[PDB]
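Exercise 7.
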Amino acid sequence: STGSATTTPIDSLDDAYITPVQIGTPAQTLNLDFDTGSSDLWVFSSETTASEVDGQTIYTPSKSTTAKLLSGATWSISYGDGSSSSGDVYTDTVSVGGLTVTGQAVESAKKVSSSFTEDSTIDGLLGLAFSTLNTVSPTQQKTFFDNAKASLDSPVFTADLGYHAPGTYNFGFIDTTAYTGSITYTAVSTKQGFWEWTSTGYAVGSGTFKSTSIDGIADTGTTLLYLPATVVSAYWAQVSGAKSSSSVGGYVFPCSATLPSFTFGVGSARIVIPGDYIDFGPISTGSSSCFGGIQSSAGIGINIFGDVALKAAFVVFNGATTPTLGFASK
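Solution. The predicted structure, written as tokens, is:
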């Protein structure tokens, strides 16, 4: 089997992407944030504290003839930005782009943090990291991909995120029309539960490539590119007036700037992030100070190849017995 679904930016900055997901019988379609940096599929629901729902579409398990309470199971998750959610668990039929999993754990939120409430466009998360990170207790549950894998034509999914435009998540096949040149595959460590790999270096604009190993994660659920302070300083030094602002929480730059590109290495291959992908717009409405899309990972404790990086590539998440990651230009 295969599946193919369009993923759409939630706003004009590509702050996140949402993908429609069918849950239950009859189908209830929710728009979920596909997140290769976590492993829980959770949704706003009829169980979510009423004051914490503000415009989201909810899953109502009592209206699904295939929903079953997973007795005694609870979940609770916190993300790197301090947001959180928790609740109980159902199993139900879940379909993405025509690919169907029966008995998928659907984690129903009883509580969500304010940031979720305040974002009406995201109805929940669909985790695509390794199932070892799943938070369900006392019996850990599998991700949608883990459950689908054996049925897929090939045990892979691909992320093809758009810049200020829709893109595609495919399951079970590689669309050879969706990228240019060849796909370069690179090793993955699953030791921390992530799609963790080592970039071979970087360049800023038309500058020379610096060969250096950068261990980090491929994370569709993180907006920005978080890299070591040395690398980030080298990038922003090429933008007149750019500075790190403790009050804003990262590098800012004059909105009048033209940003240089940023290249990252995948083995001997190179992925080029155009400068415009690194512009996250005014820090507050009407400001002429703009927020940068490349930020320091210092104090996160991990480098993150988030959407800024991934949207410059066609990315293969290869879930073979020994997982690997592939990157192609597009």
